[PDB]
Paper text:
Present in the small intestine, cellular retinol binding protein 2 (CRBP2) plays an important role in the uptake, transport, and metabolism of dietary retinoids. All CRBPs share the same protein structure architecture. These small soluble proteins fold into a single β-barrel that shields the central hydrophobic cavity that constitutes a solitary binding site for retinoids. Access to the binding pocket is governed by a “portal region” composed of conformationally flexible loops connecting neighboring β-strands. By examining chemical libraries of bioactive lipids, we provided evidence for the selective interaction of CRBP2 with a subset of nonretinoid ligands with the highest affinity for sn-1 and sn-2 MAGs that contain polyunsaturated C18-C20 acyl chains.
1-arachidonoylglycerol (1-AG) interacts with CRBP2 with a Kd of 37.9 ± 3.3 nM. In fact, as discussed later in this report, only 1-AG (S-isomer) binds to CRBP2. Indeed, the crystal structure of CRBP2 in the complex with 1-AG clearly indicates that despite geometrical differences between 2-AG and its sn-1 and sn-3 isomers, the binding modes for both molecules are identical. Inside the binding cavity, the arachidonoyl chains of 1-AG and 2-AG adapted the same orientations enforced by hydrophobic and van Der Waals interactions with the side chains of the enclosed portal region of the protein. Also, the position of the oxygen atoms of the ester bonds were nearly overlapping (root-mean-square deviation of atomic positions, 0.3 Å), as they were locked in place by hydrogen bonds between the carboxyl oxygen and an ordered water molecule (W1) as well as the potential interaction of the ester oxygen with the ζ amino group of K40. Similarly, the nonesterified hydroxyl groups of both ligands were engaged in the same network of hydrogen bonds that involved the side chains of K40, T51, and Q108. Thus, the identical contact points between these ligands and the protein observed for 1-AG and 2-AG could be achieved only by adapting an alternative orientation of the glycerol backbones in the binding pocket (root-mean-square deviation value for the glycerol carbon atoms = 1.3 Å). The only consequence of this difference is the 1 Å shift of the sn-3 hydroxyl group toward the location normally occupied by an ordered water (W2) in the 2-AG/CRBP2 complex. Thus, this water molecule is no longer present in the structure of 1-AG. Importantly, the binding of MAGs by CRBP2 is restricted to sn-1 and sn-2 isomers. Despite the use of a racemic mixture of 1-AG and 3-AG in the crystallographic experiments, the electron density for the ligand clearly indicated the exclusive presence of 1-AG (S-enantiomer) in the binding pocket.
Numbering used by the authors: 0 to 133
Write the structure that this text describes.
Amino acid sequence: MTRDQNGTWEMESNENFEGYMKALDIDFATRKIAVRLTQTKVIDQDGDNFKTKTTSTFRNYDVDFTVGVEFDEYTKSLDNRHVKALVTWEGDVLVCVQKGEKENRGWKQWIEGDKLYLELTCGDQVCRQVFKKK
Ligand SMILES: CCCCC/C=C\C/C=C\C/C=C\C/C=C\CCCC(=O)OC[C@@H](O)CO
């Protein structure tokens, strides 16, 4: 029983964020800034209802969802695309499929020990982030 992801989480590693952003067609100048940054993630979770806020000195991104309920997601200030998003549980892993113009786009987020893991996929690029609880 490790579905409770509530907390404030600080990034400690961010593997292949450059490749993930390139797969999303983020321009070089934006990648140059974004790859430098430590992200913070605040998760407010009530059962299957999630409110998430990911922050940095350069851009912030909020996404709220209920597990099992498809929603329209606009990735404002990231790659600025519209997708249909669905988050489901696979065991205690949150799995999101973002259906839209990019093939094989989604993410998976789970608790393991005292860490939050987030793997973001776009095409053949996977970015693996690890966060430690504040
Ligand atoms: C927002 C801080 C990073 C900004 C970097 C600025 C520009 C880079 C442009 C595009 C890169 C694409 C995505 C950024 C990566 C992670 C932010 C969270 C994405 C997400 O939905 O979290 C999954 C899940 O945690 C949400 O609940």
